[model samples]
Target: EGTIKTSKYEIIAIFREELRKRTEIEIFFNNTSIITQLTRVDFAEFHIQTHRKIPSGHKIRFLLHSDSGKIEFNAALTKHDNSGVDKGIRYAFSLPECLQVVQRRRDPRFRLRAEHDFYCRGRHKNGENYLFDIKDISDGGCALMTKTPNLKFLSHDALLKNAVLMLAEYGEITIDLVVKNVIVITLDEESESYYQISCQFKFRHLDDQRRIEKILLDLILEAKRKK
Candidate 1:
């Protein structure tokens, strides 16, 4: 879990001697807070040195300072372990930088329940068909959960790519997509097995784009309520 807080600016830096050490880092921002700030920070030049051991599970909070406001963020440390004399140790922020932008909130309420028919044309002649229950959709693409697994006529990768291309031909939007990950959900009361796949879409149509933004807004609101 992560969080956002309010704090003042402190021009303080921390460094460690042992390979395993904990330090606090702070960040400052200019006036006007937008989501793009998350991607604007430069973390590459920041460096730390550890003498012998490697540290695990390091955490830091990002604090922003401006003439008008302030914000804080929690970040986790990535794993970096190896043997031998460790020299200059550097910590890369694990949290998404885009979180700094006020407009870039997470969408939890965003959902799409569209009935779509997809055809597979490559490698197989029968052209498999699927009825998609789009659970969530984004500007990049959508995630769908389906029970038609036996139709394993085409590989997931091929189908996703082909679907993206076909979706582009409609002139409504051009989407380039690839499968990100897949999950199989099991229900104790239900007898059917379902698969949930996350796919990323590139270059979407404006109408579809608006739909995705609405979904993202809903998702963000849902996340806020949970907190």
Candidate 2:
């Protein structure tokens, strides 16, 4: 499998998500690493908020640990300033042509059957409501199964805002889902088709991650008893 991301769209999407998630980036230089947070992303470069001052045009290797995977890239510091809205030291780096990503998740996924009654409720852009079954779920994300017109609600690298995940036993959890992947399961001549949408959960707070962990532990116990 190709783990190297070269497409402009894919590379930028990763950075944008990192910014939105406030991902910590480690820049390596002078045999040491300085940690910083992403402040902004632009078409040609990205900025990191940090107090440490590194000279412009300095080459640095950076790593980002995101929910989707581990990202590593080499970039050159292009500029720095304190003129931004945050009024903090912001270092800008030239975008890398390619980045390497290794797929990793914090938790394993559990497959759910019809009896699980696990589904996601999201509002369509047209002001309509739609529900889709969750085929499998993990603390990090879930695979939602849908077809036809419902598929219109999702797109690659798009955000599904405030979708409610109705967990049968654990109650509803509101989450923002980032569409990671879409797989075509089946095709039909009648214009109806089967699709599997894999989305990553973007937890806004630490409490939300713990809540999902609670449900995941219950699922693990049930499977243990079944065996």
Indicate which candidate wins on TM-score. 2
Which regions in candidate 1 have their CA more than 4 angstroms from the true location? 1-109, 112-126, 150-176, 189-192, 204-211, 214-227
Output the worst ten-in-a-row residue range by lDDT, candidate 1.
Answer: 10-19
Which candidate gets the maximum lDDT versus the true structure? 2
lDDT of candidate model 1 versus the reference:
0.41
- How do all models score by TM-score? 0.34, 0.50
Count of backbone collisions in candidate 1: 14
Taking all chains together, the TM-score of candidate 2 against the true structure is 0.50
Give the clashing pairs for model 2.
Answer: none
Give the 10-residue window scoring lowest on summed lDDT in candidate 2.
Answer: 184-193
lDDT of 1 by residue, 100-211 (tens): 3132324322443232233221222355555455565555666766766434532456334335322322223334455666666432212334676666665445665675
